Amino acid sequence: SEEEFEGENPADKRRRLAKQYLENLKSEAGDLDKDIIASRLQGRVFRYFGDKLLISEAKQSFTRVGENNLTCISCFQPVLKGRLFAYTVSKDLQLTKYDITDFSKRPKKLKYAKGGAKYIPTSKHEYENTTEGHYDEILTVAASPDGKYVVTGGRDRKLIVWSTESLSPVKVIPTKDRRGEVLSLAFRKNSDQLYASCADFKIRTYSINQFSQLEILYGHHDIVEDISALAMERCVTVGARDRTAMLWKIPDETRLTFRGGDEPQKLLRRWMKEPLFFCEGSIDVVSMVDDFHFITGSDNGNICLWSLAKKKPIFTERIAHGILPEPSFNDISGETDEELRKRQLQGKKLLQPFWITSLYAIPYSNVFISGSWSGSLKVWKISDNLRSFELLGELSGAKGVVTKIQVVESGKHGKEKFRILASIAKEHRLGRWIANVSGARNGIYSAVIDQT
Amino acid sequence: KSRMQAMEEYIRESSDQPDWSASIGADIVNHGRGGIKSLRDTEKERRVTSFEEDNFTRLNITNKAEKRKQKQRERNARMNVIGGEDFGIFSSKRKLEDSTSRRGAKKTRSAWDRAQRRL
Amino acid sequence: DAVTIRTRKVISNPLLARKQFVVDVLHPNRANVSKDELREKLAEVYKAEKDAVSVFGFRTQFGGGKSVGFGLVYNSVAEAKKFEPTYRLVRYGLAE
Amino acid sequence: PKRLFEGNALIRRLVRVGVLSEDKKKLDYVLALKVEDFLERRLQTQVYKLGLAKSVHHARVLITQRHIAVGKQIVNIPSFMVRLDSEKHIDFAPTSPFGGARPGRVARRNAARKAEASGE
RNA sequence: AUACAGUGAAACUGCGAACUCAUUAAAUCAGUUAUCGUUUAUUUGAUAGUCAUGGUAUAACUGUGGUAAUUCUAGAGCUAAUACAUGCAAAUCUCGACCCUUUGGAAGAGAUGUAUUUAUUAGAUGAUUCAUAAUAACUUUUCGAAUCGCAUGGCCUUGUGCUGGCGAUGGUUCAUUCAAAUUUCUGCCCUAUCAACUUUCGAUGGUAGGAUAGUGGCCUACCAUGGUUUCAACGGGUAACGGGGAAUAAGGGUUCGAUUCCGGAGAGGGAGCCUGAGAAACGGCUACCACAUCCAAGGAAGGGCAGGCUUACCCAAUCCUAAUUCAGGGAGGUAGUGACAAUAAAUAACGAUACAGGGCCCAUUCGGGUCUUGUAAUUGGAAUGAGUACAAUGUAAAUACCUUAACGAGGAACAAUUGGAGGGCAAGUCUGGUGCCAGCAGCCGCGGUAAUUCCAGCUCCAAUAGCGUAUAUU
RNA sequence: UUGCCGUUGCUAUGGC
């Protein structure tokens, strides 16, 4: 054995011995019964419309909003009086309700609720934090699929459930932790169940109709920025600097962990065998294409397509939105000599890419939209073999930081009309790190796309 | 019988398939006294829960089997398992080459068999 | 404060005419849930009577918060009488 | 093969326990491991290092009085070994008065006595 | 309920009732056959034509009595059966001349249970004297429903005629299933300080018989003579509490667990017998032998196991046995007394103030080194485990576990031990002296026991729910 | 369509 295979490297010996081990176990090692039991008792992508879409002829309507820094937008669409609604939460502690039903017209504001400094609790003892309003900034909002409730959460460490008709709070739920700020909310589709991702490394599940908390899941090394969930009782969360994506089975309290593990030296070697490679700092946004595939955007611009069966990403589109502009040469140094200023620019090293601030995948479909503060949303199509995606179109209507993207449908099965609403803000919803982006207004950006 | 855990660990590296880890706090035997549940303990507990959920009965602890389990498995978990990872695997005297050897059919004894394998 | 009930593996047995399901009872800030109130809740969910509903075998998780058990819902009260064992009938008070 | 597979296995599980660093993946570094490397993984030491307590004795008192919860469950054993995945999730229990709960019996008796004195 | 009709004691009937002590190496056991060489309670599938209803004999039950007395008894009186005993020519076919008239109607000629024993005669299987069909007989010779509950059936003949459906329990033979008995080959230690064994319960065959459920020297007559082997027949030892991949394993102990078969005999000891589908019965009976018990001294009945140097709850689960869903199971499950080997904690954690000027390390001494240390000082709120205890869960029921409100610390008296080292004290005691010393020591002094607040409870060290001693030993 | 301001329509988008 060893004499026959003496030429092998140590890793080659490990591989062949693993192969022989697996063969030995397969050599050494009721279904109808299970079938007839299951008779007494997960979906792929079914809608393919990437190629049918026309994007350049689609309208672009950007509606200004008086609120500062619109953090999030959540759209309610009825499921077969047929009205389609939206709810926008800002850093000005304001939740605004809009009707988006008429695709031709601009969205129409119905009412608004604004929290203020009067909602600061006097006790501050972490379970007396049951005030009706928000006293700190609201990061995220979700609209219940049945349509009676809208849920707001933010840095005030509480979830407020509001009735949609009166826009008044029917419930306030403290997170009961000093450290946990609710970053993202995701309703299970066609369900009352809500999954909240908090900054205390937790995912809290609530049943909204009973206003109860089912259980809490503990998984991340860093804060859990974004959570996305389809119809079945499971969810996908992303943490920022642990650089992992986690698929949680809610009833079984188990998780699949996905790690990127990209090496810029390896990419440079691959290109030399065949540019700027930025190593990945944090994963921010996640979306579910179907029950087997999900897509994540990072801060180095990478959009990654992940399957449940593979730990590594299937596909990675690097620097998807672009590279930030070079800093001003007269600003960087402050010396009289322009050649010294150009040297202090230090060439290509100070270039940094755009962060994917928002990313939405239309469920069970090949179209997904990525948004950053480059001044253009991007529409991508997943190929039919589901290994890669390409860029269909670019929507240049919106200018500014794209915090949240939602898509709604109103049409016949032969001909569907899609409205894309992005809550454009001057700043990132988490912090004020991004500076002086040019020509950015707080508002709602709507693109209406009709298939051929 | 021929399954060995160092082999299983290397296979879990070389798969590329995610491995369904549990949550952080659910692994702890009661309040940290027993410790973190080992992977074999979690698999056996999953099998028992599936069995109970299928037959709609929860197993009462048989005296002899329960005494044997509490005498052996708990003592082995305290002695070897350290924070959910067992280290008596290295003190054990079992041999990896007995499992990793071909040992039977397709052992490649013939020179023409080796030539056919090369081809 | 309201308890939450999740039903899994619901199987209909027409020979017994029962509905057999594993019950996950999730109870934050509560010790445990009484079987009578739980029979009320499952009765209202499955639109059968409490006398038709039967539960047993509840095991409470370490740290509380989740009790897992087994539940049988019948279609008729008299049929629940003639199929249910005498000891669970005594527990439920339905029969002497 | 015994050296290959069991050395890789031993190094990986020592890393997951946390006594051995990620960049220290060698058998001679496994040999250079010492007792204090394991003793720093104790929950008493970890609570002190993370700073929930002002000393190791305060940390032991907090653990035995059940304020510290590692992950979901309250751990009340100071000799609980803490892994890499758990050391971030060590925190105060929700039931504990220190994190997000009602004050204990001492504070409640003192508040009730002060209220009775105010009423008197 | 003008036969009984509900529920049913007793009784009859039916079914089931198949621990101890000894150690064998072709014996046992394990497989593997065979039964064209056998037996069947049950299950399952088949199977039977060859009086509108017979006669008793008793129990339970009445009563009269005998005995010291037994589940002991005698006399008289009662009535039941799925108990016991008894017991019933027509119809179906073949050959149908002829008739019409083809299907058809018919002169006529003929045939016709089962079992037992034997003789004789003609479809399966590789194979039969087997299945089956006959013929003449034979039998202390059988079997071929005198039974039961749910329905009140359909005709017209309203006769109260005909016969009407679902089921019980029977019964014949064959098959099946469950077993069992024999049988076949294949396999297990050491040894020649064990070479002849068998006719020394016939040894190897043949014929006939007896016997058995049946083959067979299994037995008996008669007759031949054989059968086994230094390649070890045969014999001895085997710690043979052994071995069997018998057995689930060892889900990372170096070969280890757990389960199953041990093989036989007995149920005060020899012997004979009986009931059943199945026993040479853990049942009963007789005689014999030995114990031993009650008695009114006439008689009567009986058969140990655990302990030292034994209980309670229950058929809920698992499964089995009955006329049977239901009953029952010291099978089986559950619980209790039972540190011992050994476990994871706790016995406090943070502060604040005041006061003091010394604290510690090394070194034979001489000395040297060092620097926020000492205090039986005061004081503040916070935390919670042991516990006390409400519930639900849990289970046949309960305990326990899981969860769990309400209480739960300053002497934290919610009162940790075990060992080691070193002082010091008196109007005190003893001993030796070259004044005033030295030694041994000292719970004992002089008053005082509500009497006295005293080296403040003398200081320091180590292990800690553990910690010493003695002896042996590396 | 905007908290405010400015421009363009009388609707489009520049500034804070």
- Point out the residue among B30, B31, B56 whose CB comes nearest to the CB of C70: B56
CA distance A403 to A302: 17
A383 interfacial to chain C (CB closer than 8 Å): no
B85 interfacial to chain D (CB closer than 8 Å): yes
Buried b / exposed e over A186-225, threshold 16 CB at 10 Å, is bbbeebbbbbbbbbbbbbbbbbbeebbbbbbbbbbbbbbb
Alpha-carbon distances, residue A160 vs A10, A132, A148, A152, A185 (angstroms) = 59, 8, 13, 5, 12
- How far in angstroms lies nucleotide E444's C1' from the CA of residue A373? 102
Residue A406, both tokens: 């939602």
Angle at the Cα of A301 from the Cα atoms of A296 and A306, rounded to 5 degrees: 25
CA distance A410 to A449: 11
Angle, nearest 10°, between helix axes A10-28 and B5-14?
110
CATH architecture of residue range(s) C4-96? 2-Layer Sandwich (3.30)
CA distance B37 to B29: 6
Task: Please identify residues in chain A, positions 253-312, with a C-beta within 7 angstroms of any atom of strand F.
Answer: none
User: Coil, helix or strand for D7?
Assistant: helix
D104 interfacial to chain A (CB closer than 8 Å): no
User: Coil, helix or strand for A154?
Assistant: strand
The structure's method of determination equals cryo-EM
User: Coil, helix or strand for D47?
Assistant: helix
Q: Which residues pair with A99 in a beta bridge?
A: A85, A108
A212 interfacial to chain C (CB closer than 8 Å): yes
State the sign of the Cα–Cα–Cα–Cα dihedral B9, A292, A302, A356: negative
- Point out the residue among B24, B99, B100 whose CB comes nearest to the CB of A219: B24
Angle at the Cα of C24 from the Cα atoms of C23 and C25, rounded to 5 degrees: 110
Nearest CA to D47 among D59, D64, D62, D61?
D59
Tally of CB atoms within 10 A around A412: 7
What is the interface size between B and C, counted as CB pairs within 8 Å?
10
Q: Mark out the alpha helices in C1-96 (DSSP H runs).
A: 35-46, 77-83, 86-92
CA distance C85 to C62: 30
* C60 sits within 7 Å of strand E by its CB: yes
Cβ-defined contact of C28 to A207 (cutoff 8 Å):
no
Buried b / exposed e over A116-146, threshold 16 CB at 10 Å, is eeebeeeeeebeebebebbbbbbbbbbbbbb
Chain B residue numbers touching A309 (CB-CB < 8 A)? 17
C-beta separation of A87 from A104 below 8 A:
no
C-beta separation of A226 from A213 below 8 A:
no
Q: How many residues are there in chain B?
A: 119
* Burial degree of B80 (CB within 10 A; 0-12, 13-18, 19+): middle
C-beta separation of A167 from A176 below 8 A:
no
Contacts of A385 (CB under 8 A, 6+ apart): none
Residue A252, both tokens: 């079984």
* Burial degree of A17 (CB within 10 A; 0-12, 13-18, 19+): buried
- Which chains pack against A, by 3+ Cβ pairs within 8 A? B, C, D
Q: How far is B79 from chain D (nearest CA, A)?
A: 14
- Point out the residue among B31, B56, B58 whose CB comes nearest to the CB of C59: B58
**Considering only alpha carbons, which residue of chain D is nearest residue A13?**
D1
Cβ-defined contact of C20 to B56 (cutoff 8 Å):
yes
Buried b / exposed e over B85-116, threshold 16 CB at 10 Å, is bbeebeeeeeebeebbbebeeeeeeeeeeeee
C-beta separation of A189 from A230 below 8 A:
yes
Nearest CA to A419 among A448, A440, A395?
A448
State the sign of the Cα–Cα–Cα–Cα dihedral C46, C50, C52, C53: positive
Domain count, chain D: 1
- Which chains pack against C, by 3+ Cβ pairs within 8 A? A, B, D
Laid out side by side, the sheet with C4-13 consists of C4-13, C18-27, C65-74, C53-60
Tally of CB atoms within 10 A around A6: 8
Chain B residue numbers touching C9 (CB-CB < 8 A)? 53
CA distance C53 to C47: 10
CA distance C40 to C73: 12
C-beta separation of D27 from D7 below 8 A:
yes
Laid out side by side, the sheet with A443-450 consists of A59-64, A443-450, A417-425, A401-409
Largest CA distance in chain A: 85
- How far in angstroms lies nucleotide E209's C1' from the CA of residue A283? 106
Which range marks the domain in which residue D16 is found?
Answer: 1-120
Residue with tokens 């009067």: A118
Which 8-state DSSP code applies to residue D42? B
Per-residue three-class SS string for A358-376 = EEEECCCECEEEEECCCCC
Please give the sequence-ordered ranges of beta strands (E in DSSP) within A4-156, or none if there are none. 59-64, 70-76, 85-90, 94-99, 108-114, 138-143, 149-154
Residue A218, both tokens: 């503990």
Q: How far is A363 from chain D (nearest CA, A)?
A: 32
C-beta separation of A74 from A141 below 8 A:
yes
CA distance A417 to A94: 30
Tally of CB atoms within 10 A around C46: 16
